[PDB]
């Protein structure tokens, strides 16, 4: 055996690094959507003007 | 006499009405409309216009149908409601200049003052300016040809004075204003090569065709000035302009220092708040 | 997120293993026959029921296969099973007859739903306290149709006649249609109840009673096997103005949903050939229903060719839903159709492309359409496709309730109120029937804004989540109290805000907490 | 006794004719007539709109000349304008867009033929050039005071009808005087002809003329704007030298409404014209 | 569950990856609307006006 713990184990660790890339895409979506909320709140503010 | 003219989009939208009230009959010929404007000042200013039933013949081109009573009644009532604008000329929607236009324009040359002619397109597929002011004046030719009506191109501009800008801007809600900066500049700098490419490429093909396959003198005299001005820039060696490239490139260096330095100033609040906000919110979160 | 190119083969090859075992299982044949929908995978299991000679085990698979997972495949399997057998003979006949009946579910639902009703005088008395003669008159009767659905309780509307027929307008049409929502599944008491109202002169002064009788009858006989469509053609043949055409087209098209009959197509076309917007709107709504899965060649080009040659807008929205509902299961087909019709100059048809692609890409099987859905939701300047955009996003992303508020949270408080309202519909449809609080915690900013649109859609979206929920699990006191203060605060609110307010309050009280909804 | 939900279709014809008529909208009372075709009950479309000569009496039933009206209408009938009149419009400068007793009396007299009788009042005098929001008016029946005022279905568009929310005229005179919603329509010929016509109205003749003007004015005129731009930049940096003291003392709260960032971003945007036009000079010099 | 987290997670990879061009569209369009409304509220301020105290 020694595949699910070693081969699929390093495949799962590579999946964890893929989860790190999805954490970079994740927090990029977070701060980009918060800045999007800032611009939306400012343009909505002059819309209230 | 007249250096430039001013044409409001109201008359061209009245040509949109010319294309609206057709009724799906199958004719869609060069419907002639009575152009109105202010001939008092040196510059021509079109405010509004109207139309007259105009029908030609299929085979014979010399057939043209106008109306004097309708012109005097529409012009009489329009002058009664607004006496600040009078008759100036006419315009046809046909893309090609026919021979009968000297007889059609000759009526408004006799009864009305010197009429300006405007050729437009039935389909708004032409990227160029649809309005071309063609003054109806007789010019003396050097080759000895008899004096005839000549249509000289007068420059034109499409502007609105007070309200039509607001109405167009509200009806569109898609076009953008001047908006100096990145987008409005780079769009012109991208599509300008096509804006000259379709014009020059669209013109020099039929031009080169009429060079060898041409007769019925097309005023070959102006071709000498054409190729002359084309040969007025004989691929300058750029030797003297090197220092000019040093000047414009030095201004480029000025923009480099302004961008780097000013952006470096902008990095202050970001590269400070990123620390003082995160570490204080973190140390005070729990 | 399969592409269906291999899933159907893997299933049709993995269904050969349980037939070789000692006993067949139902979960695998159900979970396969809900996706592959192949006739060659059911012809064996329909004929093995006679060989196994087991009556009790066939009733479950017959009940749920005849229940759901197919409409036209059921329309074919009913004659496939009709051919099998006589043209145990005495038992197989009653078996095959009693399995395709389908009315036993209506009988048991009418039974326990007829003996489980719970009504309170506070709700209806509050509606009578907040009723207005102009707008919310239809909201009171639609909430009464919600709470009295299935229970056939006309005794609430038998109190007085001066509260319903006091105004000659569409309010009586919505009242009779609401009556059609109250009672359902009646072959004699429906037509008899409609005829008993004025069997004196056979000439009603208000035609909304007749139009509501045809539309209500279509509501009653929805997907029934004892349809009176044959009589509805002779009743629709009568010459009448905008009530037999509209109500008869809606009721007849709803009753003929899925039949794909060319007769209703022909009479429907000659019903829409009068260029009218209302009977053409109902003609589109009926044509989309009857053309479920038909995919006629000349019909799409005839409708889209009929669209730009008219100036009315109700005909364009009626043919918009008409060409929208016809598109089902055409994932591999409608790519060039929707992609070609997406660049149309008409904003109504631009909405029709998204409404059309909504049901076509159900199941979250395409991550490409969202690109142009949100791209036209943000890029386009007209708010029609912007508020009508994300409904397709919820219709394709209805599978996961958690992933929706993460990407529509930005649309909760958008730039214009139209994307806020359409996004409120998106949160209403994506989280319906679930218990995800990711929209509930975001409902509090939605319910307070000077715009009445986001308040109306916020009350509707809040009404679609609180259904079938207990208070001890989640603290719903906030939205219960703020939802109850709208009918007492209607004096200082807008006229439509109270309409969507009490209309939202009729959602929770629908059926007396017994009936719910499921996607 | 029946009512529906009507909506007035407004094209660019009537709009631009009300804009030229608004330019001719002198304080003196003016008159106009709207035309169109009635296809069904709850829709109305306007196509033909003209103006009327002014009179000393102003807006009145006596000013409407039936031989002049019918004469011009007949001259429209002999042409390709087979549309009947659908209503009359005018201007109410200064005192608001509301209708006086004379206007409601000539409206009551002019509504005997057409049941709809669309009425529009344009007032560009005090309206800013930012918005051209116009509203259409209607006449209610005096016998409907017992029953509901407006039994109009499809109450969704009333949110769009709530944009004119003046607190004196709409509900200050809403009794016996209501309004109706307004929508627009634009085909592809108006979209491409008017869109390309406006883009060309902001573009050049050959589109290559005024480019080199600024490309070569960057060396003559813009240099002054670059030196002055650096004078404003330094004029803010002299305060930005004092900013790290306050930012080094308090760090709590913001008291200066000036951001000092977006203005310099705009200065950089005006400074990038040299970079964007340098490639233009490279193309003109190259070929 | 152990090995299914990869292919089940790929759906979240696509669902989060699809938001990139979306937030690009929002950040590129909402600033164009920001300068549209900015110039619209800027052009309201006209030179002809009355001077008070
Ligand atoms: Zn006055």
From Swiss-Prot, chain A:
Compartments in which it is found: Cytoplasm; Nucleus
Superkingdom: Eukaryota
Subunit field text: Component of the 19S proteasome regulatory particle complex. The 26S proteasome consists of a 20S core particle (CP) and two 19S regulatory subunits (RP). The regulatory particle is made of a lid composed of 9 subunits, a base containing 6 ATPases including PSMC5 and few additional components. Component of a complex with USP49 and RUVBL1. Interacts with PRPF19. Interacts with TRIM5. Interacts with NDC80. Interacts with PAAF1. Interacts, in vitro, with the thyroid hormone receptor (in a thyroid hormone T3-dependent manner) and with retinoid X receptor (RXR). Interacts with ERCC6.
Annotated function: Component of the 26S proteasome, a multiprotein complex involved in the ATP-dependent degradation of ubiquitinated proteins. This complex plays a key role in the maintenance of protein homeostasis by removing misfolded or damaged proteins, which could impair cellular functions, and by removing proteins whose functions are no longer required. Therefore, the proteasome participates in numerous cellular processes, including cell cycle progression, apoptosis, or DNA damage repair.
Family: Belongs to the AAA ATPase family.
Identification of the protein by name: 26S proteasome regulatory subunit 8
Species annotation: Homo sapiens
Location of this fragment in the whole protein: 11 to 59 of 406
Curated annotation (Swiss-Prot), chain B:
PANTHER family found in the cross-reference section: 26S PROTEASOME NON-ATPASE REGULATORY SUBUNIT 7 (PTHR10540:SF7), EUKARYOTIC TRANSLATION INITIATION FACTOR 3 SUBUNIT F-RELATED (PTHR10540)
SMART domains found in the cross-reference section: JAB_MPN
Record GO cellular component, one term: extracellular region
Keywords, ordered alphabetically: Acetylation, Isopeptide bond, Proteasome, Ubl conjugation
Organism: Homo sapiens (Human)
Domain MPN: start-end pairs: 5-140
Subunit structure: Component of the 19S proteasome regulatory particle complex. The 26S proteasome consists of a 20S core particle (CP) and two 19S regulatory subunits (RP). The regulatory particle is made of a lid composed of 9 subunits including PSMD7, a base containing 6 ATPases and few additional components. Within the complex, PSMD7 interacts with subunit PSMD4 through their respective MPN domain. Interacts with TRIM5.
PROSITE patterns cross-referenced by the UniProt entry: MPN (PS50249)
TM spans (from-to): none
Protein family: Belongs to the peptidase M67A family.
Modified residues (N6-acetyllysine): 200, 210
UniProt gene name: PSMD7
GO terms under biological process: proteasome-mediated ubiquitin-dependent protein catabolic process
Cross-link (Glycyl lysine isopeptide (Lys-Gly) (interchain with G-Cter in ubiquitin)): 176
InterPro entries hit by this protein: EIF3F/CSN6-like_C (IPR024969), JAMM/MPN+_dom (IPR000555), MPN (IPR037518), MPN_RPN7_8 (IPR033858)
Note: Does not bind a metal ion.
A Pfam match: JAB
Stated name of the protein: 26S proteasome non-ATPase regulatory subunit 7
A single MF term (Gene Ontology): protein homodimerization activity
From Swiss-Prot, chain C:
Modification type N6-acetyllysine: residues: 491
Keyword Phosphoprotein carried by entry: yes
GO (cellular component) term, any one: proteasome accessory complex
Residues modified as Phosphothreonine: 86
UniProt keyword list: Acetylation, Phosphoprotein, Proteasome, Repeat
PC repeat residues: 174-207, 212-245, 247-281, 282-316, 318-351, 352-387, 388-420, 422-456, 457-497, 500-519
Record carries keyword Repeat: yes
Assembly, per entry: Component of the 19S proteasome regulatory particle complex. The 26S proteasome consists of a 20S core particle (CP) and two 19S regulatory subunits (RP). The regulatory particle is made of a lid composed of 9 subunits, a base containing 6 ATPases and few additional components including PSMD1. Interacts with ADRM1. Interacts with ZFAND1.
Similarity remark: Belongs to the proteasome subunit S1 family.
Its biological purpose: Component of the 26S proteasome, a multiprotein complex involved in the ATP-dependent degradation of ubiquitinated proteins. This complex plays a key role in the maintenance of protein homeostasis by removing misfolded or damaged proteins, which could impair cellular functions, and by removing proteins whose functions are no longer required. Therefore, the proteasome participates in numerous cellular processes, including cell cycle progression, apoptosis, or DNA damage repair.
This protein's name: 26S proteasome non-ATPase regulatory subunit 1
Organism: Homo sapiens
Taxon lineage: Eukaryota, Metazoa, Chordata, Craniata, Vertebrata
UniProtKB/Swiss-Prot annotation, chain D:
Record's signal peptide: none
Entry protein name: 26S proteasome non-ATPase regulatory subunit 14
The gene coding this protein: PSMD14
Organism: Homo sapiens
PTM sites of type Phosphoserine: 127, 201
A Pfam family reported for this protein in Swiss-Prot or TrEMBL: JAB
Gene Ontology molecular function: endopeptidase activator activity; K63-linked deubiquitinase activity; metal ion binding; metal-dependent deubiquitinase activity; metallopeptidase activity; proteasome binding
Record's keyword annotation contains Nuclease: no
Residues holding Zn(2+): 90, 92, 103
InterPro entries the UniProt entry points to: JAMM/MPN+_dom, JAMM_MPN+_peptidase_M67A, MPN, RPN11_C
Sequence motif: JAMM motif, positions: 90-103
Gene Ontology CC annotation, any one: cytosol
Tissue: Widely expressed. Highest levels in heart and skeletal muscle.
Keywords for the protein's UniProt record, in alphabetical order: DNA damage, DNA repair, Hydrolase, Metal-binding, Metalloprotease, Phosphoprotein, Protease, Proteasome, Ubl conjugation pathway, Zinc
Annotated family: Belongs to the peptidase M67A family. PSMD14 subfamily.
GO BP terms, alphabetized: double-strand break repair via homologous recombination; double-strand break repair via nonhomologous end joining; proteasome-mediated ubiquitin-dependent protein catabolic process; protein deubiquitination; protein K63-linked deubiquitination; regulation of proteasomal protein catabolic process; response to ethanol; ubiquitin-dependent protein catabolic process
EC number of this enzyme: 3.4.19.-
Highest taxon of source: Eukaryota
PTM annotation (Phosphothreonine): residues: 243
PROSITE patterns per the UniProt record, alphabetical: MPN
MPN domain residues: 8-143
């Amino acid at each position: 055996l020694e595949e699910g713990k070693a081969g699929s184990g390093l495949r799962q660790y590579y999946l964890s690094k893929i989860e790190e890339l999805q954490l970079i895409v994740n927090d990029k979506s977070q701060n980009l959507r918060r800045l999007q909320a800032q611009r939306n709140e400012l343009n909505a503010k002059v819309r209230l003007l | 006499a007249v250096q430039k003219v001013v044409v409001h989009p109201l008359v061209l939208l009245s040509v949109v009405d010319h294309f609206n009230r057709i009724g799906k009959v199958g004719n869609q010929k060069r419907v002639v409309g009575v152009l109105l404007g202010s001939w008092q000042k040196k510059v021509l200013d079109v405010s509004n216009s109207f139309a007259v039933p105009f029908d030609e013949d299929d085979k014979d081109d010399s057939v043209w149908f106008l109306d004097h009573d309708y012109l005097e009644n529409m012009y009489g009532m329009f002058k009664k409601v607004n006496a600040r604008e009078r008759i100036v000329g006419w315009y046809h929607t046909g893309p090609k200049l026919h021979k009968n236009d000297i007889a059609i324009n000759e009526l408004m040359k006799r009864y009305c003052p010197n009429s300006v002619l405007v050729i437009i397109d039935v389909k708004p597929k032409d990227l160029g300016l649809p309005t071309e002011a063609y003054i109806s004046v007789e010019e003396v030719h050097d080759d000895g040809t008899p004096t005839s009506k000549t249509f000289e191109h007068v420059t034109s501009e499409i502007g609105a004075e007070e309200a039509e800008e607001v109405g167009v801007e509200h009806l569109l809600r898609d076009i953008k204003d001047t908006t100096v900066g990145t987008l409005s500049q780079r769009i012109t700098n991208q599509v300008h090569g096509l804006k000259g490419l379709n014009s020059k490429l669209l013109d020099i093909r039929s031009y080169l065709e009429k060079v060898a396959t041409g007769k019925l003198p097309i005023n070959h005299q102006i071709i000498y000035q054409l190729q002359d001005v084309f040969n007025l820039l004989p691929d300058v060696s750029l030797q003297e302009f090197v220092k000019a490239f040093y000047l414009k490139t030095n201004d480029q260096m000025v923009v480099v220092y302004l961008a780097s330095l000013i952006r470096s100033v902008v990095a202050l609040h970001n590269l400070i708040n990123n620390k003082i906000a995160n570490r204080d919110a973190e140390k005070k979160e729990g | 997120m399969q592409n269906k190119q291999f899933r159907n083969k893997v299933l049709r090859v993995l269904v050969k293993i349980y037939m070789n075992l000692e006993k067949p299982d139902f979960i695998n044949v159900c979970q396969c026959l809900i996706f592959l929908d192949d006739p060659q995978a059911v012809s064996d299991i329909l004929e093995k029921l006679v060989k196994e000679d087991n009556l009790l085990m066939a009733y479950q698979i017959c009940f749920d296969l005849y229940e759901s997972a197919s409409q036209q495949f059921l329309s074919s399997v009913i004659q496939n099973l009709r051919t099998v057998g006589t043209p145990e003979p005495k038992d197989q006949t009653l078996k095959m007859i009693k399995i395709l009946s389908g009315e036993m579910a209506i009988e048991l639902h009418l039974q326990f739903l007829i003996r489980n009703n719970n009504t309170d005088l506070m709700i209806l008395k509050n509606t009578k306290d907040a009723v207005r003669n102009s707008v919310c008159h239809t909201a009171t009767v639609i909430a009464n149709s919600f709470m009295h659905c299935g229970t056939t309780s006309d005794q609430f509307l038998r109190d007085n006649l001066e509260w319903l027929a006091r105004a000659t307008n569409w309010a009586k049409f919505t009242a009779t249609a609401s009556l059609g929502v109250i009672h359902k599944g009646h072959e004699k008491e429906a037509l008899q109840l409609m005829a008993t109202y004025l069997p004196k002169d056979t000439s009603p002064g208000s035609a909304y009673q007749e139009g509501g009788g045809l539309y209500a009858l279509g509501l009653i006989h929805a997907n029934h096997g004892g349809d009176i469509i044959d009589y509805l053609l002779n009743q629709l043949k009568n010459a009448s103005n905008d009530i037999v055409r509209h109500g008869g087209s809606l009721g007849l098209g709803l009753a003929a949903m899925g039949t794909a009959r060319q007769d209703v197509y022909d009479l429907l076309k000659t019903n829409l050939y009068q260029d009218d917007a209302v009977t053409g709107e109902a003609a589109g709504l009926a044509l989309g229903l009857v053309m479920l899965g038909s995919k006629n060649a000349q019909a799409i080009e005839d409708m889209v060719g009929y669209a730009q040659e008219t100036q009315h807008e109700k005909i364009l929205r009626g043919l918009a839903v008409g060409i929208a509902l016809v598109m089902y299961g055409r994932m591999e087909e409608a790519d060039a159709l929707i992609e070609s019709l997406c660049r149309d100059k008409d904003p109504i048809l631009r909405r029709s492309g998204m409404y059309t692609v909504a049901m076509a890409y159900c199941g979250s099987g395409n991550n490409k359409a969202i690109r142009r859905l949100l791209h036209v939701a943000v890029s386009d300047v007209n708010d029609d496709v912007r508020r009508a955009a994300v409904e397709s996003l919820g219709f394709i992303l209805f599978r996961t309730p958690e992933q929706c508020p993460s990407v529509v949270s930005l649309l909760s408080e958008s730039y214009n109120p139209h994307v806020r309202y359409g996004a409120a519909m998106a949160l209403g449809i994506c989280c319906a029937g679930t218990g995800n609080k990711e929209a509930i915690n975001l409902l509090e900013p939605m319910t307070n804004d000077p715009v009445n649109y986001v308040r109306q859609g916020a009350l509707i979206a809040s009404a679609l989540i609180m259904i079938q929920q207990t208070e001890i699990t989640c603290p719903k006191v906030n939205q219960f109290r703020q939802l109850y203060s709208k009918v007492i605060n209607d004096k200082h609110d807008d006229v439509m805000a109270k309409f969507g307010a009490i209309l939202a309050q009729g959602i929770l009280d629908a059926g007396g907490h017994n009936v719910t909804i499921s996607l | 006794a029946v009512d529906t939900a009507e909506q007035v279709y407004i094209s660019s014809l009537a709009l631009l004719k009300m804009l030229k008529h608004g330019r001719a909208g002198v304080p003196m009372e003016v008159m106009g007539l709207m035309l169109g075709e009635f296809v069904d009950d709850y829709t109305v479309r306007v196509i033909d709109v003209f103006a009327m000569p002014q009179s000393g009496t102003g807006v009145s039933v006596e000013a409407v000349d039936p031989v002049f009206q019918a004469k011009m209408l007949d001259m429209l009938k002999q042409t390709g304008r087979p549309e009947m009149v659908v209503g009359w419009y005018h201007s109410h400068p200064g005192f608001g867009c509301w209708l006086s007793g004379v206007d409601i009396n000539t409206q009551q007299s002019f509504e005997a033929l057409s049941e709809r009788a669309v009425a529009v009042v344009v007032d560009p005098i005090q309206s800013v050039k930012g918005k051209v929001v116009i509203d259409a008016f209607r006449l209610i029946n005096a016998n409907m005071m017992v029953l509901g005022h407006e039994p109009r279905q499809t109450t969704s568009n009333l949110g769009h009808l709530n944009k004119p929310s003046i607190q004196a005229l709409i509900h200050g005179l809403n009794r016996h005087y209501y309004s109706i919603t307004i929508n627009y329509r634009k085909n592809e010929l108006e979209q491409k002809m008017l869109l390309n016509l406006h883009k060309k109205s902001w573009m050049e003749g050959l589109t290559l003329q005024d480019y080199s003007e600024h490309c070569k004015h960057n060396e003559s005129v813009v240099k002054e704007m670059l030196e002055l731009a650096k004078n404003y930049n330094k004029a803010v940096e002299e305060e930005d030298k004092m900013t790290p003291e306050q930012l080094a003392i308090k760090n709590v709260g913001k008291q200066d409404p000036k951001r000092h960032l977006e203005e310099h971003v705009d200065v950089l945007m005006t400074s990038n014209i040299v970079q964007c036009l340098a490639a233009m000079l490279d193309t003109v010099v190259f070929k | 569950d152990l090995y299914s987290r990869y292919k089940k997670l790929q759906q979240e990879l696509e669902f989060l990856e699809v938001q990139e061009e979306y937030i690009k569209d929002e950040q590129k369009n909402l600033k164009k609307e920001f300068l549209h409304a900015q110039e619209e509220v800027k052009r309201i301020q006209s030179i002809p006006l009355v001077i008070g105290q």
